[PDB]
Design a protein around this ligand. Structure first.
Ligand SMILES: CCCCCCCC(=O)OC[C@H](COP(=O)(O)O[C@@H]1[C@H](O)[C@H](O)[C@@H](OP(=O)(O)O)[C@H](OP(=O)(O)O)[C@H]1O)OC(=O)CCCCCCC
Ligand SMILES: CCCCCCCC(=O)OC[C@H](COP(=O)(O)O[C@@H]1[C@H](O)[C@H](O)[C@@H](OP(=O)(O)O)[C@H](OP(=O)(O)O)[C@H]1O)OC(=O)CCCCCCC
Ligand SMILES: CCCCCCCC(=O)OC[C@H](COP(=O)(O)O[C@@H]1[C@H](O)[C@H](O)[C@@H](OP(=O)(O)O)[C@H](OP(=O)(O)O)[C@H]1O)OC(=O)CCCCCCC
Ligand SMILES: CCCCCCCC(=O)OC[C@H](COP(=O)(O)O[C@@H]1[C@H](O)[C@H](O)[C@@H](OP(=O)(O)O)[C@H](OP(=O)(O)O)[C@H]1O)OC(=O)CCCCCCC
Ligand SMILES: CCCCCCCC(=O)OC[C@H](COP(=O)(O)O[C@@H]1[C@H](O)[C@H](O)[C@@H](OP(=O)(O)O)[C@H](OP(=O)(O)O)[C@H]1O)OC(=O)CCCCCCC
Ligand SMILES: CCCCCCCC(=O)OC[C@H](COP(=O)(O)O[C@@H]1[C@H](O)[C@H](O)[C@@H](OP(=O)(O)O)[C@H](OP(=O)(O)O)[C@H]1O)OC(=O)CCCCCCC
Lengths: 227, 227, 227, 227, 227, 227
């Protein structure tokens, strides 16, 4: 694949994050990315060539396959993985902006050495005191919360879309009724059992990730209330 | 693929750029390159072998396929990606030229230590004061503006070409009328729905990028007016 | 494949581990990962195309194949390898937490230089004395033991599942009785002998790993009793 | 592919070159190498299997294909790319020889510290004064000019060969007359339109490169006359 | 392939070894690994699809192929390569243990500065005097000898197994007698000549390696007697 | 491919070599390795599936193909490349042995500071004076000459074998006479013209390399006579 850039960026962002965020990144790296690339994507290798129908009408097989699978599961999961990673990058960008502000303020104070008072109050407001121990307060906390909410809503929306379109199982026999197939025809899928097992596994993984980020949100809210 | 060199050059150029430029580079890396390489290009894997027509005339299938698809979408998108990346490299080259001029002027001034006056006026004219904080003024701003305009016009031209040639959807049945096929024949495509979905997705991404660079141009014009 | 990330993490974790753990990691890297990727996975390359049955009823071949192989052995082994590696990562995370606590306590004591007494008692309780010679005592030992137990139970559960589903051999002829195949039909597998040999080899490797981790658990219990 | 070594050597040689040479190297890296590897080579993926003729005489298809395509375009372009890169490596070798001579002369002068006069005259003759600012004078200029001429003549020779053999377009229908095909037969190509488009694109790129190196030669001649 | 980890470990272990061991490692890297990966494994690319028999009885081809090839040569050679590399890793582990003991003893002596006498006698017994010039004496020599013997016996056992199973040549025509094939049938192999040539080449390489390690054992025994 | 290790070793050995040796290494890297991997090996991609004969006798096609091609050209060229690279590695090993001797002698002399006389005479005999400027004298020259002779004889032997077996062209039609084909049959090859062109190209490259190493041998003999 080509997941090198996204993996590198996630490795860059995982340095400064909460424990729940680190666990979420770890499970995303292990189960969502590694498992799909290694063995899951090989199952959908001949979902088109092994598909066949019980007719001799030309062109009915392509129409029935297009009717049966509007979009492959592997591509759907890739799109989901892409769409549940942007807000972390947004948080990384905001952290880098905070770092730039810290560097400029440090340069100004080094130049200086009531200005000390305002420099210190600005360094405390952004949570930059130890030169490498950026804390979450004011803006970073807001960005983190909105990122968590966006990730959760994207995941639940994708899950609902998948539930509406396909369901959570693949029957061994599919009934096709569309031109130019005369009347109704019978078509047979390929590897229904493995696909059902992997779909259930991915559903479980998605639910676990949802619960994990919910726990992370609750913990960060409690930490904010602590102050 | 072989996108390593272009990715490395873009990673080199992203160090000194405006926020809008950085966001544009990020979206180009994520959606334009990564998504196409990972899953999109696999859909157009058997657009030739799965294509079939309702006739037994030899050689009609090849002619009808050539009539239907003058150029594959994947190759068109690759060409578009290549053609909407050169001006950034031109800006990078101009920045490197400015760096070379800065190094030579620094060498001359170190040698010296009214010549100081002209050295300082030349260092201010090119915006080279802090030895690593090159600012946009005079020539760099002009190059940046012309690069943005060239990128925008290339993108809109490619979009217009795609609209004229194909459209934005693929019908499940295609009508073919060309020798040696007798009279008219019916041919059936492969995976119309996935291809339509991905075409719409790419169109949305291109429009978003166009809006982003328009916003970047407006912001840089306002910044120039600020002076 | 894409085993780079997991291999890197295991290379990170192997630095601080017992001898039995190092031997287990070595055998996992050599026989479980390298062997499967190099030659074993190529055997299951045409288990679908070479499968054929003695009938001309349309769609019976797909149904019989789905009946015969609920899940491929290669995917099962990949899932097993993934599921017998998490607790080591958990131990690595706990070790990193101990390192963070050590760094914070060192910072506090450097700041100080009865507080010395409590600093020393906390550094001894976590087994952090030589600044890079973390010892197993109290919590690390408990985490190590529970990780070993979890790994063992996961391995035995996977072995039992494989025994119940398939067995440990593949007969050259399979009997299929499922709709729409009329009455009973005969279907012939592909490369039964190589698959049986590799299944037996993997079973032997799994048993060896089980014995090795049992020995490691006994040795660590004896070491704990030594104190 | 395996273009890593040649790319590394070109990256090594681009450090010391004229602006025209750098632009030529950039366009060679972008359009000649990257574009061909990414998408162009995939078009010629089934030029043999999709080729078919209107006959049932055994062995006529292979003979007609061999008659139609003496050598594939992709292989021809690869050979051209290889044959229009050697003189740059020759220039790199000569530069390395100059560097070796500079190092030996520096060692001899460091040992010494009329010999100073001859050391200085030899350091000026080879254009080695600043220890890392090698200038083009005498021999390097001659090597550069002959390298440019060799590159230009190789490119024009390859272009003429391609014009004589194929032309610049591929007709959808080819007429074959060769044993054992009885009388004349009709054979149909695969993807004529994409191949014609890419051939025209490569021709334009080659012409642009020719013009660029002509401009570089004129500029370097003017620079030589400047002295 | 995935031979990166084993190659890295062998590169780590080759630093401290006898000349015969280094030559054996070099020949193993060149002829056993590189040659098999580059060109040898491509020959066994269609040993299943090109195999065909002279009958129309369904399912006889699979049975006859399974009868003819119990296990492919490429997989057998991969298993042999894996099984003739473990003892070197065991020697590497013992060397690392010696290094750990050396580091601990050095730490204790640095702390000290009759204890000097025992420290020196322990440093001489393990052959650790120059801090990086570990010599073979007592235990390392025993481990080296047993590793050489284990490697030799594994190689000869694999050679005997291959001789018993297949032989050293592949006849162009194979006779098959097994159900459901009626009476006897004739089946034809694929590329017999290349496979025979490569089998003979691998046999010669294995014999050369056996002779080389025998010479290494004799030389190390003579060196031990020298003391 | 897997040419990384051999390429790395050749990159290691090219540091200390004569100009002719460096040119030979460069041409070997460019034309022998890069060209074969990039485009040449793709031509022999379907030399088995596209091969067909004018008969309906079962099993005659495999026999005729085995008769026609005892060993593929690509594998022959890979074997040749492997067999014309060992003596350079032998020279590298001898150079490393000389380096080890130099390091030990330097250690002994540093310890010392008539022994100086013998140390200096041994350092001059092996041509080790400047600590990094090893010269060819006595043994290194002999090893270099024998390596050149071995390389030349291996290349000429491989060329003679290829001339005897195949020739230097491939006719479009092959006549096959071997059981079970009745009487004589006609079989047709695949892509004869491209294969002939590439064979002629490889022959020219081999002759050029032979001439280059002959020139290198003559030059080194003249240099030896110079002393
Ligand atoms: C049931 C768990 C409920 C809490 C779950 C909390 C989340 C969880 O499960 O792991 C993350 C957590 C915090 O780790 P983290 O390093 O971020 O935080 C440490 C500590 O918990 C405080 O946050 C700070 O120290 P102190 O206290 O001011 O001296 C300081 O962090 P910060 O403030 O500078 O950033 C650290 O010393 O790790 C723990 O071990 C918590 C202690 C209890 C671990 C044992 C379980 C009670
Ligand atoms: C609605 C936003 C409209 C503006 C969008 C502007 C574009 C946008 O959305 O992000 C980029 C922007 C500029 O970032 P950047 O680092 O380039 O610029 C900072 C700052 O904005 C000034 O440009 C300079 O400081 P000062 O001011 O002279 O002390 C100095 O940059 P420069 O001059 O040395 O290169 C920096 O401190 O980031 C912000 O946070 C803007 C502040 C407002 C952020 C909050 C929103 C108002
Ligand atoms: C039959 C083997 C039964 C034991 C199997 C034990 C497991 C096994 O087979 O290998 C691991 C083992 C321990 O190695 P490791 O480096 O962890 O431990 C060394 C030593 O054994 C003690 O643990 C400590 O030294 P001391 O003793 O306090 O001076 C110190 O470790 P630690 O305490 O600081 O972490 C080390 O010097 O290696 C051996 O050579 C054991 C000695 C006997 C090797 C010869 C066989 C008796
Ligand atoms: C129409 C252009 C015609 C010329 C095209 C020339 C080719 C072209 O388009 O780009 C390359 C060119 C030379 O760049 P390069 O760094 O090699 O050369 C710089 C300069 O031009 C002189 O060559 C030298 O300085 P000076 O002058 O002695 O103080 C010194 O180089 P050198 O001598 O130590 O190696 C450098 O300062 O870049 C320019 O900006 C030229 C100035 C005009 C740029 C603006 C356009 C006039
Ligand atoms: C027919 C060859 C029979 C012997 C084959 C022996 C094996 C073979 O063919 O290559 C390996 C061999 C030993 O190399 P290696 O570096 O291990 O050993 C060198 C030397 O031979 C002694 O072993 C030691 O020096 P000294 O002697 O105490 O001053 C010291 O090694 P060590 O003791 O510190 O580890 C080294 O100086 O290389 C040679 O050149 C041997 C000399 C003769 C080379 C010329 C042929 C006679
Ligand atoms: C027709 C060519 C016939 C000779 C072909 C010779 C082979 C060829 O074509 O390139 C290699 C050659 C030698 O290069 P290399 O760096 O090995 O050798 C240089 C020099 O030639 C002498 O060998 C030594 O210097 P000096 O002389 O003692 O001060 C010293 O090398 P060494 O001794 O310390 O190792 C070096 O300065 O390069 C040349 O430029 C030769 C000079 C003439 C180049 C111009 C052509 C005459």
């Amino acid at each position: 694949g080509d997941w090198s850039a996204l993996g590198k960026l996630l490795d860059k962002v995982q340095a400064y994050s909460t424990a729940g965020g680190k666990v979420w990144l770890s499970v995303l790296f292990i189960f969502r990315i590694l498992l799909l690339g290694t063995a899951v994507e090989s199952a959908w290798g001949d979902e088109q060539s092994a598909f066949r129908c019980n007719t001799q009408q030309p062109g009915c097989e392509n129409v029935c396959y297009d009717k049966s699978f509007p979009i492959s599961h592997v591509r759907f999961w890739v799109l989901q993985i892409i769409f549940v990673s942007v807000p972390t990058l947004l948080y990384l960008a905001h952290v880098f902006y905070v770092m730039r502000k810290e560097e400029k303020l440090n340069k100004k104070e080094e130049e200086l050495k009531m200005h000390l008072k305002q420099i210190e109050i600005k360094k405390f407001k952004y949570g930059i005191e130890e030169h490498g121990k950026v804390k979450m307060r004011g803006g970073l906390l807001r960005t983190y919360i909105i990122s968590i909410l966006f990730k959760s809503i994207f995941e639940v929306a994708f899950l609902l879309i998948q539930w509406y379109i396909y369901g959570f199982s693949l029957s061994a026999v599919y009934t096709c009724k569309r031109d130019p197939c005369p009347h109704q025809v019978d078509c047979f899928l390929s590897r229904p059992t493995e696909k059902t097992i992997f779909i259930i596994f991915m559903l479980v993984v998605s639910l676990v990730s949802l619960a994990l980020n919910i726990i992370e949100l609750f913990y960060v809210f409690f930490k904010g209330v602590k102050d």
